């Protein structure tokens, strides 16, 4: 359990921060066979000071489908496997939903990759100051805050408060029930439920504009200013749809803060 916590849910530093950073350099027309990144996996555990365990083996990182191909795609699945007398408790259906939340957090990692890219892209042009440089850099700082908002929500619910439970629940059917409740709360706190589906749908529209901000270098400034305006437009709509869904939740109560401090 505390191994899959470090593997798929990614509570391991310099393991996520070595995998996604290495992988996004390549992409696609490359990285189409799972025989290199499945060995980069074994190199990333050594960089995380958690490897060489028996949990480090029986892992598998592969593509479930070759794409036909700005791109936000994710179809790369990490899996952890267990032997026969423990397979009856850790079933084949729980590992599929573990990979289902893994793809979501991997899509979160591309944001911190591309935002770092535009951060460095604006760092390299810094001589003398100019109005064009500062008024563009503030959009990057602005977008950065909203990702530290959604990350602070996830770092409270899925990794941490359901980690208080499943620590005082594991004291033969009981263990399987405990494991099922941990996963079922992890997907409900993951905002993949149909109740919070309008909350989830706008996050993709946020991600798309940040990648459109990433590709670009007035040089092009008005086209990016419009993108930042569409960004604040979508977020101010998000502030209303999160309030409507607490007027008609204990886990959603954490959100309508994080998006808004000391402001109307």
């Amino acid at each position: 359990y505390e191994a899959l916590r470090h593997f798929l849910l990614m509570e391991d530093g310099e393991f996520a921060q070595s995998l996604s950073d290495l992988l996004f350099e390549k992409l696609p027309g490359e990285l189409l066979n799972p025989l290199v990144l499945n060995s980069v996996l074994s190199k990333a555990l050594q960089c995380s000071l958690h490897g060489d365990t028996p949990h480090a083996s029986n892992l598998s990182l592969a593509l479930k489908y070759l794409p036909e191909v700005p791109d936000v795609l994710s179809c790369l699945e990490l899996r952890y496997k267990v032997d026969w007398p423990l397979n009856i408790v850790i079933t084949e259906g729980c590992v599929s939903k573990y990979s289902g939340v893994f793809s979501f957090l991997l899509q979160l990692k591309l944001m911190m990759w591309a935002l770092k890219d535009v951060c460095f892209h604006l760092k390299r042009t810094a001589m003398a100051g100019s109005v064009q440089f500062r008024q563009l850099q503030l959009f990057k700082h602005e977008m950065q805050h909203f990702v530290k908002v959604i990350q602070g929500y996830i770092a409270n619910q899925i990794l941490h408060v359901t980690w208080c439970e499943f620590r005082a629940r594991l004291a033969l059917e009981e263990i399987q029930r405990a494991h099922a409740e941990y996963l079922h709360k992890a997907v409900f706190r993951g905002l993949l439920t149909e109740k919070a589906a309008p909350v989830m749908n706008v996050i993709h529209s946020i991600f798309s504009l940040v990648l459109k901000f990433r590709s670009q270098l007035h040089p092009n400034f008005a086209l990016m200013q419009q993108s930042y305006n569409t960004f604040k437009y979508y977020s101010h709509f998000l502030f209303k749809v999160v309030t409507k869904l607490v007027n008609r939740q204990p886990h959603l109560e954490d959100f309508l803060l994080r998006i808004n401090f000391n402001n109307y």
């Binding site: 810094a126 500062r134 503030l138 950065q144 805050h145 908002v149 770092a155 208080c164 803060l257 000391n262």
Partner: protein, 420 residues
């Protein structure tokens, strides 16, 4: 990646040595250097790892006419380091010219540990502002490592000289070094002597031997600020992602520091957050207010209580601050360190952009101006006269810091759609 630290000044070399003593107490090594088998932790970003069982800290030890470095030798930590970089003025310009004439061999010492490690992230400069031997030389190497490597990060550990008026040449020196820190460093961690002296007189009964106590206070701060990097967290556990959240404007990179145990010689999170926001637990000395705050926690912390605690400060109206952006207050969590005696289990950090420090700056911008009217306190050194015959570079630096003060005063208000 790996981070190289450089310490100069006698006071800077002292606090760097005490900092490595604190980390030797922290990390799984003995005071000879030999590994202890009691130990999770990473000793790679600040310690070069051979198999000589004495892991050498990644420090560059430079000096001028070594006096206190002899006292650094007579210690059980003389087997922790020997990279052979010890080499034998009074003003910024004299120290700058003395750093100018010997730049090749000290930069060879820099190129040595640059080629020694393969991954490189950042340079920490342990330096005292207007410190004599530190001033001039530190600004010179600051200019040179930023000019030579634009792909790395530059951080500085720096104290502020304040004695409430004696050295008459200090506003010139601090003025020039502040220009060099604003244009040749990406982030500056600012401390002053006066607030730590005030807190030290609050906790203890000290008047004369203050230096030996405030060094301990500083070292506790610098170890605490590195606990999130040395022990693997998942938020800002590299230097780059840490500094990328703290800068809303590229002229503002000065970070306010606090520490929730004011004395160490049960708790829930709302308690330490509210104790944290108080100005007495702050270590750095009209409406002046924060732009954005990051607070870092270390201890036995339940995850749901931090959400309630942040909700509490939201309800208190302790947020009487108002910049022009929605970039907000920030919480982070890291673990309390094992492996050492750990009293006062839950302890806090703050990393914040506050404009009250601009008052401190304009005090220097006051003082130099008065001396500029008198023209009897420049002390007329010969290398100072040859380095600048008209002394208009101090006037240009005064212009730059005046623009810095105007940008601060524009950043205070919620109206920064126009440049200040």
């Amino acid at each position: 990646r790996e981070i190289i630290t450089l310490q100069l000044g006698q006071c800077g070399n002292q606090i760097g040595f005490e900092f490595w003593k604190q980390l030797c107490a922290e990390h799984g090594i003995s005071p000879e250097g030999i590994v202890e088998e009691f130990a999770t932790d990473r000793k790679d970003v600040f310690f070069y790892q051979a198999d000589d069982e004495h892991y050498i800290p990644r420090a560059v030890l430079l000096d001028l006419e070594p006096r206190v470095i002899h006292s650094i030798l007579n210690s059980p930590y003389a087997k922790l380091y020997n990279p052979e970089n010890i080499y034998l003025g009074n003003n910024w310009a004299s120290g700058f010219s003395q750093g100018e004439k010997i730049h090749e061999d000290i930069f060879d010492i820099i190129d040595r540990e640059a080629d020694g490690s393969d991954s490189l992230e950042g340079f920490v400069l342990c330096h005292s502002i207007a410190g004599g031997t530190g001033s001039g030389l530190g600004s010179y190497l600051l200019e040179r490592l930023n000019d030579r490597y634009p792909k790395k990060l530059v951080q500085t550990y720096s104290v502020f000289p304040n004695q409430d008026e004696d050295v008459v040449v200090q506003p010139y020196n601090s003025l020039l070094t502040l220009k060099r820190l604003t244009q040749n460093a990406d982030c500056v961690v600012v401390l002053d002597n006066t607030a730590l002296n005030r807190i030290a007189t609050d906790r203890l009964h000290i008047q004369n031997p203050s230096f030996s106590q405030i060094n301990q206070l500083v070292s506790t701060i610098m170890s605490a600020s590195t606990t999130t990097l040395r022990y693997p967290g998942y938020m800002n556990n590299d230097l780059i992602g840490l500094i990328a959240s703290l800068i809303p404007t590229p002229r503002l990179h000065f970070l306010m520091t606090g520490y929730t145990p004011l004395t160490t010689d049960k708790t829930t999170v709302l308690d330490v957050m509210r104790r944290l926001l108080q100005p007495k637990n702050v270590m750095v000395s009209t409406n002046h207010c924060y732009i954005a705050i990051l607070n870092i926690i270390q201890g036995e912390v339940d995850p749901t209580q931090v959400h309630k605690s942040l909700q509490r400060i939201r309800e208190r109206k302790l947020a009487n601050f108002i910049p022009w952006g929605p970039a907000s207050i920030q919480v982070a969590l890291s673990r309390k360190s094992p492996y050492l005696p750990s009293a006062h289990r839950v302890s806090g950090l703050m990393m914040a952009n506050h404009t009250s420090i601009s008052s401190l700056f304009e005090r220097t911008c006051r003082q130099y101006d008065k001396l500029r009217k008198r023209e009897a306190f420049l002390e007329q050194f010969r290398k100072e006269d040859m380095f600048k015959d008209n002394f208009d570079e101090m006037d240009t630096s005064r212009e730059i810091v005046q623009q810095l003060i105007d940008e601060y005063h524009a950043a205070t208000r919620p109206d920064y759609i126009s440049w200040g």
